[PDB]
Amino acid sequence: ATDTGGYAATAGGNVTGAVSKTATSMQDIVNIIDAARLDANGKKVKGGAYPLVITYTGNEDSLINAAAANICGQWSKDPRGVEIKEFTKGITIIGANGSSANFGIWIKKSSDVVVQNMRIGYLPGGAKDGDMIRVDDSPNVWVDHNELFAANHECDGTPDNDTTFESAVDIKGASNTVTVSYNYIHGVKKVGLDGSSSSDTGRNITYHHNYYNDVNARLPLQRGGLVHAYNNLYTNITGSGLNVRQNGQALIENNWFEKAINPVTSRYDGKNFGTWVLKGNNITKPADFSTYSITWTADTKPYVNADSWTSTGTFPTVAYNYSPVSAQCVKDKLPGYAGVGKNLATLTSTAC
Ligand SMILES: [Ca+2]
């Protein structure tokens, strides 16, 4: 099955001929991927020689706990991450229950990559792109059931006063189809881009069943293309939520917003505002803003907020099958399905 409930359609490494490998450390993952490029005769194969399902059993709680206790010492350290570059055979990196990582996963020019059940937090190297997950020039990637966290805080004197920590799930380039689902993202200042610049526009991304809590912004910072955000729980958003820019289109349906500032907006460019189609959220009209503590702020440059809470454009027919539960159900049940150690459980209307 290649069904991710979103734009990406991939089975990752769970295909025919997949080779199962256990990784006990960051280094093992690197070595395993490196060996997966060799054919029977020891010669390298472009895109990889065989599919892989890597089970990561490592635990780096010590590193995570030390980092949490000294958050401002993280940005200047060397970034730590496993790069999955030009591997198209199909790969799934799934964490064992109880595993943890103080390193990121950087996907570059690959495809059919799935990252599940990984608990990644307080990564070093914010000043040198220490992303928890980065998807660059990579279509058909599925980031599902992970816990990505740090501290929603900015230390004094970091480069650009924005590098205490990098992002949770940055997406850029030709990452044409991506599904980000069932993740528990908390304590993150910059959650994730959708295009690295004003010119890096496009892509079709689906954000569904994610639980955001105490995050500052970029859910995502969208640039062009299509974004389908459904069944997500957005609470304690301290800056802005979905920032639809460079003429992007978004379908925001059956989500639960609460204690959020600028939950849906288009700001920082001063032009080429994106559009949104709102339907089925806990917020149905401006009268609900006070009920759920929705706050709005202006910007120094021309901007568009959804303070009228009305659709400002259209959205193409959703190309895949999905069935959202109600916004009330995500509020009630989502926390028990999102993140790690949930055995990749999915929230169905049956459980509502
Ligand atoms: Ca980044």
**Cα of 349 vs its chain's centroid, Å:** 24
Cα–Cα distances in angstroms (integers) from residue 341 to residues 51, 103, 338, 344, in the given order? 25, 19, 9, 8
Domains of the chain: which residue ranges?
A: 1-352
Q: Say which DSSP state 77 is in.
A: S
Nearest 5°: the CA angle 164, 207, 18 is: 95
Centre of ligand 1 to C-alpha 135, Å, is 10
Centre of ligand 1 to C-alpha 241, Å, is 18
Please list, in sequence order, all residues whose beta carbon lies within 8 angstroms of the beta carbon of residue 44, skipping any fewer than 6 positions away.
37, 38
Beta bridge partners of 191: none
- The burial of 55, by beta-carbon neighbours within 10 Å (0-12 exposed, 13-18 middle, 19 or more buried), is given as middle
131 is in an annotated binding site: yes
59-62: list long-range contacts, CB under 8 Å, 24+ apart: 59/98, 59/99, 59/100, 60/100, 60/101, 60/102, 60/103, 61/100
Say which residue the tokens 């635990």 belong to. Answer: 59
- As a whole number of Å, the CA-based R_g of the chain is 19
Closest CA to 52 of 82, 27, 88: 88
The dihedral region occupied by 40, where left means phi > 0, alpha psi between -120 and 50, and beta the remainder, is alpha
Q: Among all residues, which ones are annotated catalytic?
A: 218
- The burial of 80, by beta-carbon neighbours within 10 Å (0-12 exposed, 13-18 middle, 19 or more buried), is given as middle
Architecture field, domain 1-352: 3 Solenoid (2.160)
Centre of ligand 1 to C-alpha 49, Å, is 29
* Phi–psi pair at 329, nearest 5 degrees: -65, -35
Q: What is the resolution of this structure in A?
A: 2.2
Neighbours of ion ligand 1 (CB under 5 A): 129, 131, 166-167, 170
